[PDB]
PDB file of C-alpha atoms in Angstrom:
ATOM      1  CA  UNK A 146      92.107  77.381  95.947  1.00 23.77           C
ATOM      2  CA  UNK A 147      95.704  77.574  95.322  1.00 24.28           C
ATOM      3  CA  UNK A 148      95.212  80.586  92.952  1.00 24.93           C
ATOM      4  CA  UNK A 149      95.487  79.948  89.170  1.00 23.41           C
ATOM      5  CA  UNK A 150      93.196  79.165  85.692  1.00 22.52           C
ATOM      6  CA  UNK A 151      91.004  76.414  86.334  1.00 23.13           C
ATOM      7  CA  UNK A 152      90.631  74.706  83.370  1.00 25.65           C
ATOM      8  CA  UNK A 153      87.706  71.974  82.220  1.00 23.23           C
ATOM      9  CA  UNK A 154      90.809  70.814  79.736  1.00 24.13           C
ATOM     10  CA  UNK A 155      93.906  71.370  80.831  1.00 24.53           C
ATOM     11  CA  UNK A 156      97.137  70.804  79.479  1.00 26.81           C
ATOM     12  CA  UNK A 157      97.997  67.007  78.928  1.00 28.19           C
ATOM     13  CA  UNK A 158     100.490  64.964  80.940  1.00 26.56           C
ATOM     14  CA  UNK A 159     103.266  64.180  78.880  1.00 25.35           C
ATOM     15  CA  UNK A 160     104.331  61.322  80.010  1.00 25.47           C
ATOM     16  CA  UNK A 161     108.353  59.465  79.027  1.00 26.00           C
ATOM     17  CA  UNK A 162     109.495  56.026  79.731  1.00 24.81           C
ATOM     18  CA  UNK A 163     112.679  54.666  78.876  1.00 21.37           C
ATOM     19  CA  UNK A 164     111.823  51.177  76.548  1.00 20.73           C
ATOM     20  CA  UNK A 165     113.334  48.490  79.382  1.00 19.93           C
ATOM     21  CA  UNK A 166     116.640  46.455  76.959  1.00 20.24           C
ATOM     22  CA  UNK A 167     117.089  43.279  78.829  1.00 20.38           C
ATOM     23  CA  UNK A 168     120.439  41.821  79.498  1.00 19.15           C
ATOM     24  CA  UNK A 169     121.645  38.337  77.880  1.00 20.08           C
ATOM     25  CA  UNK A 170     119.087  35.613  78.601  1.00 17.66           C
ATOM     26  CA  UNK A 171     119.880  32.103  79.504  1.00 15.14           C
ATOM     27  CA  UNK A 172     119.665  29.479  76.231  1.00 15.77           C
ATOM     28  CA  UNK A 173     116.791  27.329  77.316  1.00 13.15           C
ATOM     29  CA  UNK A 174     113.675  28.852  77.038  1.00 13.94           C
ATOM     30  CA  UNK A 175     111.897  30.004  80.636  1.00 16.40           C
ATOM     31  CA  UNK A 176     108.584  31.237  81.499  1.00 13.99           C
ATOM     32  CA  UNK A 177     109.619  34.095  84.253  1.00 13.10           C
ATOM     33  CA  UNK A 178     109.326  37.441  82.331  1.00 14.45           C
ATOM     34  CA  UNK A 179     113.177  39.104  83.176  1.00 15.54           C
ATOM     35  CA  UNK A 180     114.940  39.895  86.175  1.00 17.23           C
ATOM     36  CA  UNK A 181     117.899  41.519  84.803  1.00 16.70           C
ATOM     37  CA  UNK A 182     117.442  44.798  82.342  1.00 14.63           C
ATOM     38  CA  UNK A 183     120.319  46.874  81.250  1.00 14.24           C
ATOM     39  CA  UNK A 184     120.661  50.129  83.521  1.00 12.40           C
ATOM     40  CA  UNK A 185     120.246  53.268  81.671  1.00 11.01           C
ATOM     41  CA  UNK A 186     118.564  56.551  81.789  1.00  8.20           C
ATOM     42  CA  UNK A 187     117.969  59.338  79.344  1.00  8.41           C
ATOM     43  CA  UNK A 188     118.690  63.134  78.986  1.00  9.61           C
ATOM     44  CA  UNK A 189     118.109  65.542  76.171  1.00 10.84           C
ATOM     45  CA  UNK A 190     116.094  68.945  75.980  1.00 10.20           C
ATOM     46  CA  UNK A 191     112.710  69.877  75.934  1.00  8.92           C
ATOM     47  CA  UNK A 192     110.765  73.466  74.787  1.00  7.76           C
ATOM     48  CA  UNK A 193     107.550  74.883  76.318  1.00 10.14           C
ATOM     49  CA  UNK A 194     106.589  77.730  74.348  1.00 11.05           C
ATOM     50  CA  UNK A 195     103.424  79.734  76.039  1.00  9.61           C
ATOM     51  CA  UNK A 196     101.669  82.024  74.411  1.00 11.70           C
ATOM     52  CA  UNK A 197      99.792  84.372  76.664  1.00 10.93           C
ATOM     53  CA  UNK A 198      96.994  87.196  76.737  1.00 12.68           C
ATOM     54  CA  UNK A 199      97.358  90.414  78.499  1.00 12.67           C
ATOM     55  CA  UNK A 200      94.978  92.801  79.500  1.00 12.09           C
ATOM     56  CA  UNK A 201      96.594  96.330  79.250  1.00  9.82           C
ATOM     57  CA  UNK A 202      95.581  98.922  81.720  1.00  9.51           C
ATOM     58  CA  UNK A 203      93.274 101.631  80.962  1.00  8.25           C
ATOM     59  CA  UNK A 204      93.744 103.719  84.087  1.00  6.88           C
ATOM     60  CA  UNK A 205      93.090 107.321  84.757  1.00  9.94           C
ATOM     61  CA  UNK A 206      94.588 107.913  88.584  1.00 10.81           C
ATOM     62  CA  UNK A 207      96.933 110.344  88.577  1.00  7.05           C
ATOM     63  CA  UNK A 208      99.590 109.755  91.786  1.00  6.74           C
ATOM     64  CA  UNK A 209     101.397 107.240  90.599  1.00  2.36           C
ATOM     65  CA  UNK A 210     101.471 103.655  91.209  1.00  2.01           C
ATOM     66  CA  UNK A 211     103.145 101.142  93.983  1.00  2.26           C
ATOM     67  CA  UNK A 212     105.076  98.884  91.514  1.00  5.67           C
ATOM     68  CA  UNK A 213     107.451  95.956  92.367  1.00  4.47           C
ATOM     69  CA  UNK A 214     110.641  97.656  92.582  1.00  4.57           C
ATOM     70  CA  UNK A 215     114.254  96.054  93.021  1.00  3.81           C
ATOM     71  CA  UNK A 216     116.005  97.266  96.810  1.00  3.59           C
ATOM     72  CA  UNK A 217     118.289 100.227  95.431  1.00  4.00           C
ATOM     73  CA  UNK A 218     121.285  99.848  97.946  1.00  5.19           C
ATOM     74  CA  UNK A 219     124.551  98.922  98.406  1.00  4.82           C
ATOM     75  CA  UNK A 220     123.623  94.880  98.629  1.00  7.19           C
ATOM     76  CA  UNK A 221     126.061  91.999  99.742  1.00  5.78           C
ATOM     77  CA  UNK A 222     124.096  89.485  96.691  1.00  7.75           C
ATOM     78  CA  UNK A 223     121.858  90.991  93.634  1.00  7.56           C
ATOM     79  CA  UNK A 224     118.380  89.232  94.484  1.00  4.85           C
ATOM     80  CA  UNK A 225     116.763  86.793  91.751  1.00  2.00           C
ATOM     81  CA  UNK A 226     120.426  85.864  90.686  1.00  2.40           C
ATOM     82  CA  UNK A 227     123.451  83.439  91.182  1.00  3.54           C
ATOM     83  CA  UNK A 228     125.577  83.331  94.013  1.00  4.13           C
ATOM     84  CA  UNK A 229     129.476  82.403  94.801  1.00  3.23           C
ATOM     85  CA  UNK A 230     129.020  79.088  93.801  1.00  2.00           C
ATOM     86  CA  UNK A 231     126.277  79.141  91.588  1.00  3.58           C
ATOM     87  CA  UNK A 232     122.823  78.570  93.260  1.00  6.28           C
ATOM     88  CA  UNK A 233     119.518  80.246  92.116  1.00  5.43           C
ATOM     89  CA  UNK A 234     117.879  81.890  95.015  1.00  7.45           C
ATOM     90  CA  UNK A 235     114.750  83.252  94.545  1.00  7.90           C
ATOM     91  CA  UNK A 236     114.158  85.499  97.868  1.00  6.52           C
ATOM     92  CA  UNK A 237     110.854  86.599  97.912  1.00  8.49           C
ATOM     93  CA  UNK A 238     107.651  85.756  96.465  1.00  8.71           C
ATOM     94  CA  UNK A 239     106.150  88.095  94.110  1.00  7.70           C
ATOM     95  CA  UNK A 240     102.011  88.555  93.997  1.00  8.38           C
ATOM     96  CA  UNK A 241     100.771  89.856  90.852  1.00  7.09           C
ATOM     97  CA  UNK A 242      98.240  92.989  92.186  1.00 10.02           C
ATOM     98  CA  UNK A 243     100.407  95.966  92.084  1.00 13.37           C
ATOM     99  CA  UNK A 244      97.561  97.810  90.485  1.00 12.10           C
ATOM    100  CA  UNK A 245      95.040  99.788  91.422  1.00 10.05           C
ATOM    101  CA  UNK A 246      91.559  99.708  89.464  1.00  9.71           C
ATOM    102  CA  UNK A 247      88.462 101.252  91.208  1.00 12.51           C
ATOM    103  CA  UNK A 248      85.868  98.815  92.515  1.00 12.66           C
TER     104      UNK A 248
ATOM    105  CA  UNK B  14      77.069 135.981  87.911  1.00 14.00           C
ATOM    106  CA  UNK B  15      76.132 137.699  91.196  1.00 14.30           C
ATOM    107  CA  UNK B  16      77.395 140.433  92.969  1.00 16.57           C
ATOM    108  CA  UNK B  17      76.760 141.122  96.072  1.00 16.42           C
ATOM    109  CA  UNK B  18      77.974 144.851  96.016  1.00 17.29           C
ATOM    110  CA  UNK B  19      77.352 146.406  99.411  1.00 15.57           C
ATOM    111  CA  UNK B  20      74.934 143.394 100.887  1.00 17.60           C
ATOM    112  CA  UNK B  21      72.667 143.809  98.045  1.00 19.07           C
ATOM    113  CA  UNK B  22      72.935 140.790  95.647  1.00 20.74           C
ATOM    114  CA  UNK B  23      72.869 142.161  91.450  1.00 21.49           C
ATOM    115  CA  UNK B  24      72.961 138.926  89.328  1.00 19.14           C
ATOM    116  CA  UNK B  25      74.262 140.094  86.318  1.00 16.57           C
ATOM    117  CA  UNK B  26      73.627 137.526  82.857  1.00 13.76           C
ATOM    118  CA  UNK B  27      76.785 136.960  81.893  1.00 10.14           C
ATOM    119  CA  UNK B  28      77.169 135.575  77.851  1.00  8.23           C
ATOM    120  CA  UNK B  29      80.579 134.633  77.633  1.00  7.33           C
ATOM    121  CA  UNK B  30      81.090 132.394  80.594  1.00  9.75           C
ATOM    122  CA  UNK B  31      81.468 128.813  79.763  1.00 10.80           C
ATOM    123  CA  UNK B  32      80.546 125.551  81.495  1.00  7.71           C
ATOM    124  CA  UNK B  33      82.465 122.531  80.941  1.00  8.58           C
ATOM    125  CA  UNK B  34      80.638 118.834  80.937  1.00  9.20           C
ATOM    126  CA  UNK B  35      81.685 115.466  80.183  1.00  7.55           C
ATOM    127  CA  UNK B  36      80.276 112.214  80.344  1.00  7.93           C
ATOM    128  CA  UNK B  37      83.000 109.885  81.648  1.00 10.09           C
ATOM    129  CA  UNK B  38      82.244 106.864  79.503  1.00 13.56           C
ATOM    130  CA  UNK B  39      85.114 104.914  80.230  1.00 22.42           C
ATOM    131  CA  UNK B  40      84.510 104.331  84.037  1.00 20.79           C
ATOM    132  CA  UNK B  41      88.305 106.092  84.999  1.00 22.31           C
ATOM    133  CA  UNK B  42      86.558 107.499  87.894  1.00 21.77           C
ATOM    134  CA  UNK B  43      84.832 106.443  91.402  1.00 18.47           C
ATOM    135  CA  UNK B  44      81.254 105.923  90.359  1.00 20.06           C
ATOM    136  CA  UNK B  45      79.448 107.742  93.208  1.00 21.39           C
ATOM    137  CA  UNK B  46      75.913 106.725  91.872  1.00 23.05           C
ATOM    138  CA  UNK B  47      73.896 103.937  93.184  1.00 22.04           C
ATOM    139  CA  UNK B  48      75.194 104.834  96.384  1.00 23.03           C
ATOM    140  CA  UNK B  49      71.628 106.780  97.236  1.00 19.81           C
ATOM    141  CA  UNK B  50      72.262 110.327  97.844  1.00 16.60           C
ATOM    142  CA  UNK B  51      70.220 112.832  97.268  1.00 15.68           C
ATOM    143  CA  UNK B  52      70.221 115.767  94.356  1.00 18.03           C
ATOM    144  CA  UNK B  53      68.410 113.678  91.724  1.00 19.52           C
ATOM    145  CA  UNK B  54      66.003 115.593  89.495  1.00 18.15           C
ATOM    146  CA  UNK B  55      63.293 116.234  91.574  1.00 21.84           C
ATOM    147  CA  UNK B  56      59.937 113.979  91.492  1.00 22.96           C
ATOM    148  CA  UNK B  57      57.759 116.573  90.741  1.00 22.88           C
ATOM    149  CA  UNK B  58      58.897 118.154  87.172  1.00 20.09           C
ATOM    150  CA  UNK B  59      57.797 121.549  88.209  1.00 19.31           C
ATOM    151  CA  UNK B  60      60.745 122.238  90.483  1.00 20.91           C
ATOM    152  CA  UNK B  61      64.188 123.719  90.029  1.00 18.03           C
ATOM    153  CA  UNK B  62      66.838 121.294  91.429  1.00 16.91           C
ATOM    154  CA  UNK B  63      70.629 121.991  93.067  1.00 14.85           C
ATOM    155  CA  UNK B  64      73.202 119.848  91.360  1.00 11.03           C
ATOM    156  CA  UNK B  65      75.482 117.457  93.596  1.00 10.03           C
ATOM    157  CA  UNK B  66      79.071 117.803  94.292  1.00 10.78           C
ATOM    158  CA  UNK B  67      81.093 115.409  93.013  1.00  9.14           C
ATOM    159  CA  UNK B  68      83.490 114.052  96.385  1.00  7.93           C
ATOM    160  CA  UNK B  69      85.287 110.502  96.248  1.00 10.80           C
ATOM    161  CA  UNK B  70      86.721 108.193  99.134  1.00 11.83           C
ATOM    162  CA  UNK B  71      89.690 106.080  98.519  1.00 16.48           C
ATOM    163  CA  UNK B  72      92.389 104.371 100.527  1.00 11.01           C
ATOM    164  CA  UNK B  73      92.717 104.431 103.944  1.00  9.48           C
ATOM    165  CA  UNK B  74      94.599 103.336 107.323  1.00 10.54           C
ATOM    166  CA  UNK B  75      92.150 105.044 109.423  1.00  7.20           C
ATOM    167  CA  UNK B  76      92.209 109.146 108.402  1.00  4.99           C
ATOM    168  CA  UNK B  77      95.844 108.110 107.039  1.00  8.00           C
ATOM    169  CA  UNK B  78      96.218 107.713 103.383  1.00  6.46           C
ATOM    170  CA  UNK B  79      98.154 103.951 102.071  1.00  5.25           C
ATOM    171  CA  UNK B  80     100.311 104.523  98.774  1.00  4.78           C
ATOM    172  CA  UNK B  81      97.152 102.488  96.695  1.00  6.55           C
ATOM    173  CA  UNK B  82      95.307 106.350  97.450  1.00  7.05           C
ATOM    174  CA  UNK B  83      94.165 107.356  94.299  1.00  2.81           C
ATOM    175  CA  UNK B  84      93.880 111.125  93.185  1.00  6.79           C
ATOM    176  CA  UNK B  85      91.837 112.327  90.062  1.00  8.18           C
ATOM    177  CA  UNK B  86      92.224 115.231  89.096  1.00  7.77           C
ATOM    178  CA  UNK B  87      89.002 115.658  86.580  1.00  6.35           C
ATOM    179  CA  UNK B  88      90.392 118.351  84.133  1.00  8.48           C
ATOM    180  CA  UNK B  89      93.196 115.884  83.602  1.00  9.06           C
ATOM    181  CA  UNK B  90      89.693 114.608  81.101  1.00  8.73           C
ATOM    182  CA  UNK B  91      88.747 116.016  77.979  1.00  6.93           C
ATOM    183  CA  UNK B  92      85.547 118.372  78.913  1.00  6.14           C
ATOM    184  CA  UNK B  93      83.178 120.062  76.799  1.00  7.29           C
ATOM    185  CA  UNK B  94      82.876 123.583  76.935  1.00  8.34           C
ATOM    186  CA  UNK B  95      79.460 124.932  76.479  1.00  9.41           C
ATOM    187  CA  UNK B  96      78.790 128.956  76.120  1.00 10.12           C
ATOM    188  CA  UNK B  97      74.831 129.992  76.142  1.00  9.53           C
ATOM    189  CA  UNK B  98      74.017 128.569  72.717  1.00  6.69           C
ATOM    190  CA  UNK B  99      75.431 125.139  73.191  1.00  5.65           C
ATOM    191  CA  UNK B 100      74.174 121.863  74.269  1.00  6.22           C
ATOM    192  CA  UNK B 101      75.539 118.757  75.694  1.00  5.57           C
ATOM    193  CA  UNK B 102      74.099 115.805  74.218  1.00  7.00           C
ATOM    194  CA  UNK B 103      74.852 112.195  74.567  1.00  9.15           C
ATOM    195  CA  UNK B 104      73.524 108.471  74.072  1.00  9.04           C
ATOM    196  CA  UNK B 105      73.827 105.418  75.822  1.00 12.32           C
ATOM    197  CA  UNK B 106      72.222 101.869  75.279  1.00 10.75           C
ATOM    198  CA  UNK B 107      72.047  99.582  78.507  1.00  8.66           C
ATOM    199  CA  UNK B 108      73.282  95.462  78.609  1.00  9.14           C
ATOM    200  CA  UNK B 109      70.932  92.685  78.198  1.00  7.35           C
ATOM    201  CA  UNK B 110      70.569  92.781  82.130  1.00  8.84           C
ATOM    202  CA  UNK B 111      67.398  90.180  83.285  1.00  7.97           C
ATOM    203  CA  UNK B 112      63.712  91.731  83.896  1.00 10.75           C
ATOM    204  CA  UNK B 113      63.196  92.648  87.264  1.00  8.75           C
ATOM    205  CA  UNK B 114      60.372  89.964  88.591  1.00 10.71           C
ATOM    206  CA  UNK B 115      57.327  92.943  88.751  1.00  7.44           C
ATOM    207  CA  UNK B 116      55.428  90.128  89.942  1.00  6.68           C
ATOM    208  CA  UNK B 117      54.449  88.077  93.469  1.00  8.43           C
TER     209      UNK B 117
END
């Protein structure tokens, strides 16, 4: 109901975990599991690579069509960029049905 | 062709006129048809029948027209022209659509 590709199978969670290093334990043996781990965290990169289908048009209107255009002006900020101190504002949200195929 | 020289119709045969038909099998168009008009062939096969004109409806804000209005023009389509010795011919083979239920 939020739009989208329902899927029976979808893609599977990929799920991460730093392994928990404990710190120094005492010398006599105790039962307790730990209450003292060595802080860390990770970071690295990660690729998602989709491959998609598309279904080209086969239209034969003539006028032509209403297509998502960029605002040709004089603007203060280009839209779908970075601003004076580097923040990515996206300002609008963009449907996909721009086209026009008869019912 | 038919002229109607001082209020008296002549039609004349004319042999070098064409007619142009195509079959748009590629759906481009509005599909008019199973809308229930009239200017089928008639029941009766003894009876010479007026063809339709072909009118579409698009796109509208009332008698306005939005920017999704659609125009075909429909010799902007690759026709077939057809003197008095020619014949259009085509085939077509329907989808494995269910049997209607002739049956209570």
């Amino acid at each position: 109901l939020m739009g989208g590709f329902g899927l029976k199978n979808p893609p599977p969670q990929i799920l991460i975990k730093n392994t928990p290093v404990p710190a120094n334990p005492p010398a006599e043996f105790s039962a307790t599991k730990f209450a003292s781990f060595i802080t860390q965290y990770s970071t690295g990169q990660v690729s998602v690579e989709i491959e998609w289908e598309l279904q080209k048009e086969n239209s034969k209107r003539w006028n032509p069509e209403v297509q998502y255009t960029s605002n040709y002006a004089k603007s203060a900020n280009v839209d779908f960029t970075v601003d004076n101190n580097g923040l990515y504002t996206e300002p609008r949200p963009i449907g996909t049905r721009y086209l026009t195929r008869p019912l | 062709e038919v002229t109607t020289n001082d209020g008296v119709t002549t039609i004349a045969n004319n042999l070098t006129s064409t007619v142009q038909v195509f079959s748009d099998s590629e759906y481009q168009l509005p599909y008019v048809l199973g809308s229930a008009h009239q200017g089928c062939l008639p029941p009766f096969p003894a009876d010479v029948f007026m063809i339709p004109q072909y009118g579409y409806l698009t796109l509208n804000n009332g008698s306005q027209a939005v920017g999704r209005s659609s125009f075909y023009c429909l010799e902007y389509f690759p026709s077939q022209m057809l003197r008095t010795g020619n014949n259009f011919t085509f085939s077509y083979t329907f989808e494995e659509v269910p049997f209607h239920s002739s049956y209570a």
